[PDB]
Amino acid sequence: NTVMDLRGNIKVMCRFRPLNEAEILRGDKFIPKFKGEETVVIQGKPYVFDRVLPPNTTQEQVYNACAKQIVKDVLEGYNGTIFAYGQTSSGKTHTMEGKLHDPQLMGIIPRIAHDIFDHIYSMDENLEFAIKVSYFEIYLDKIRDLLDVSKTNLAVHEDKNRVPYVKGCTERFVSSPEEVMDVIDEGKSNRHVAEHSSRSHSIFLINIKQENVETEKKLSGKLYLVDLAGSEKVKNINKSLSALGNVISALAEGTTHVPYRDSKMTRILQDSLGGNCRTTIVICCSPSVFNEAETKSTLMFAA
Ligand SMILES: Nc1ncnc2c1ncn2[C@@H]1O[C@H](COP(=O)(O)OP(=O)(O)O)[C@@H](O)[C@H]1O
Ligand SMILES: [Mg+2]
Numbered sequence: 001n002t003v004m005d006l007r008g009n010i011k012v013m014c015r016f017r018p019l020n021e022a023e024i025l026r027g028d029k030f031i032p033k034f035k036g037e038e039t040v041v042i043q044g045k046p047y048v049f050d051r052v053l054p055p056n057t058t059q060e061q062v063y064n065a066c067a068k069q070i071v072k073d074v075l076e077g078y079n080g081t082i083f084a085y086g087q088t089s090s091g092k093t094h095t096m097e098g099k100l101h102d103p104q105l106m107g108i109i110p111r112i113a114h115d116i117f118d119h120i121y122s123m124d125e126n127l128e129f130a131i132k133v134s135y136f137e138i139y140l141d142k143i144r145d146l147l148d149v150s151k152t153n154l155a156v157h158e159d160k161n162r163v164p165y166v167k168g169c170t171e172r173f174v175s176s177p178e179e180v181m182d183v184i185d186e187g188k189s190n191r192h193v194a195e196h197s198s199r200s201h202s203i204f205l206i207n208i209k210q211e212n213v214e215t216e217k218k219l220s221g222k223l224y225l226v227d228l229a230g231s232e233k234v235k236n237i238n239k240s241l242s243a244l245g246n247v248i249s250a251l252a253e254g255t256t257h258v259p260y261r262d263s264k265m266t267r268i269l270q271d272s273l274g275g276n277c278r279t280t281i282v283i284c285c286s287p288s289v290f291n292e293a294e295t296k297s298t299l300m301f302a303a
């Protein structure tokens with residue numbers, strides 16, 4: 001959807017982060033200019049987005065602009081993806097997970113958590129839910145499961161009925177917002193070390209299933225939260241982000257065939273990416289000169 005027009009439904013948003021302690025000491029010039037709620041400029045000719053989020057924008061502000069709508073109709077049987085993009089340091093991980101237990105500094109995923117268990121708990125009623133989550137990285141084109149260090153190079157089969165999935169990826173049923181937090185921690189705790197996260201894609205899946213206890217009828221929704229690896233140029237390739245780009249721009253033209261198979265990632269996410277779905281990309285940029293290099297690359301990744 002009652003708040004989603006058209007097969008996609010790709011929105012691109014642009015969070016600029018504040019200059020940090022280093023950058024201010026150094027005396028970094030500050031390059032971006034903000035015309036309105038959607039436009040940003042550097043040197044010349046604009047970039048237009050669904051939304052621009054200047055340094056001042058709070059997490060709670062970011063959540064409402066990017067996630068809250070997606071959350072509502074996952075609870076109504078639809079699939080959704082939220083991407084965080086940008087060079088290393090831009091604030092992708094600030095945006096997606098934040099400080100998990102500060103009520104003010106926590107990012108999207110914890111906020112999605114609290115949100116979910118609040119629609120659910122203002123009602124049931126006759127609705128009984130099963131919420132399971134999967135947490136896995138894609139490093140060097142292999143699918144490492146962050147919930148089970150046994151599993152690396154996991155395999156992408158295509159289901160029964162046409163569309164891809166990830167065989168035998170650990171699932172972990174949760175039932176409180178903090179149990180959702182736990183799974184993020186568990187994975188951070190299984191996650192390889194030696195920057196490593198700076199060079200691998202994090203996929204966080206929240207699978208909500210619900211059944212009516214009388215009518216018996218049931219809905220299923222999937223919400224993927226993805227923390228993409230830095231887009232900079234200066235642990236390899238990252239043709240991946242190009243496959244991603246290829247998919248998005250394709251959807252947003254109204255051709256007919258979409259380069260899903262071009263990467264493991266766009267293969268997996270295919271059923272939560274395009275058509276009936278919502279996909280919001282949060283591209284994250286630094287306002288410094290010292291990163292204007294990538295800032296502009298990052299900026300035109302979208303269209
Ligand atoms: N919008 C913001 N407001 C305040 N601090 C931020 C913001 N964005 C990033 N930071 C801080 O700057 C650093 C870089 O963020 P990070 O999420 O690690 O970027 P990336 O994930 O792209 O490497 C972190 O210490 C983070 O907490
Ligand atoms: Mg990061």
